[PDB]
């Protein structure tokens, strides 16, 4: 494990080859999750890019957070996508949380500490525990098949994951940077493998 606190992975160039793979102590397939992230990129005005790619042997794009140039955010589980439209956007470090639940199908997407509308997606699905989690790229195949035109150029960190949908109160505690412990992916106790020209540098955001 490494304490990545106050450091972030910086992706200065567009390539298919720069990524970092994160290893999770998963065992049972997920019935719910939260991922919270912090990232800065200027690409949002120019093209779509992968913010968080989760893939499994049976389903590439098993969880994905993406930006679509003309549309805003999109969220995918189990190969099925919902939009979270954001037509006017500003360049700054953005914190987000996504959370999803199999029992309800309800998707919550939080942007810079405010929820979007609670949506619905993939009610009843189950997410594979043999996950290739990749930062910096979108996966067309388990652990690979990256597309350079979908890579992130920018800076990503404070990536945390839970086995469960956080409360609004808990998402607010995380956004304000109070003390919390994630139980599926923990930024202070991270297990990861960097490849290509990726650098670890002190974070731009507070």
């Amino acid at each position, epitope marked *: 494990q490494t304490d990545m606190s106050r450091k972030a992975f910086v992706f200065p160039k567009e390539s298919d080859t720069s990524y970092v793979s994160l290893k999770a102590p998963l065992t049972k397939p997920l019935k719910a999750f939260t991922v919270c992230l912090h990232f800065y990129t200027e690409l949002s005005s120019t093209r779509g890019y992968s913010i968080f790619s989760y893939a499994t042997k049976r389903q590439d794009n098993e969880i994905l957070i993406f930006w679509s140039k003309d549309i805003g955010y999109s969220f995918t589980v189990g190969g099925s996508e919902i939009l979270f439209e954001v037509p006017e956007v500003t360049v700054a470090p953005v914190h987000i949380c996504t959370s999803w639940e199999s029992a309800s199908g309800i998707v919550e997407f939080w942007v810079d500490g405010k929820p979007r509308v609670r949506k619905s997606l993939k009610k009843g699905y189950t997410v594979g525990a043999e996950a290739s989690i990749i930062l910096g790229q979108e996966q067309d195949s388990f652990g690979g098949n990256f597309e350079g035109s979908q890579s992130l150029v920018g800076d990503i960190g404070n990536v945390n994951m839970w086995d469960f949908v956080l409360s609004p109160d808990e998402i607010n505690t995380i956004y304000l940077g109070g*003390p919390f*412990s994630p139980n599926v992916l923990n930024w202070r106790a991270l297990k990861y493998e960097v490849q290509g020209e990726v650098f670890t540098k002190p974070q731009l955001w507070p």
Partner: antibody
Amino acid sequence: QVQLQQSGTELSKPGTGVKMSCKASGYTFISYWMHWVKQRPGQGLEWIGYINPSTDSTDYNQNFKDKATMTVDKSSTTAYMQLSTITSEDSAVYFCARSHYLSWDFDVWGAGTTVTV
Amino acid sequence: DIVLTQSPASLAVSLGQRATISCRASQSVSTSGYSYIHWYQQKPGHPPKLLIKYASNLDSGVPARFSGSGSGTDFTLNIHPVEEEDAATYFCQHSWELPLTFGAGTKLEI
């Protein structure tokens, strides 16, 4: 009031198994993890694991991953721990404790169940 | 996993004085100014009572003589004035990762 009430002392033989309960009361059982922790008589503390009642999901100290099995009943706010093929080395007080499921401080504790093997 | 090594094993204190109990983590357990260390009091025959959370946050219903401190690998619990009620055994715990671990404890003796 917020409290945890456990099932009380279990007496058992080598090669048996015991299941001890932890009734939570006075709070929303779903909003918290239940932790379980061992204490040998006069010696230390030994964390067993947790259960998330919201997701029915558990993790264990690697010394217990084949000894223990945690479960909950959400219909009656009762946590359990089952101890498998218990042996004299398993004789201890076993406490259940709450934590707010983001922060792993053990906020409130049950009285403990003595198991004498 | 994180070892917490805790010192001294027991502590003899007059009423009215100061008890200082120390805990060493094998790792830094501070990030972003918080530190994932917790202190409990257990009286014999009772379950532990949380005293201090995150090295220094005094829990509600705890007297002001209890005051935790520290950062990084090195943490302490002070009791001052140490008082007859404080005849107890004290444990540090971390919240940094799984598994959660406890210190061996210290017993405070008048």
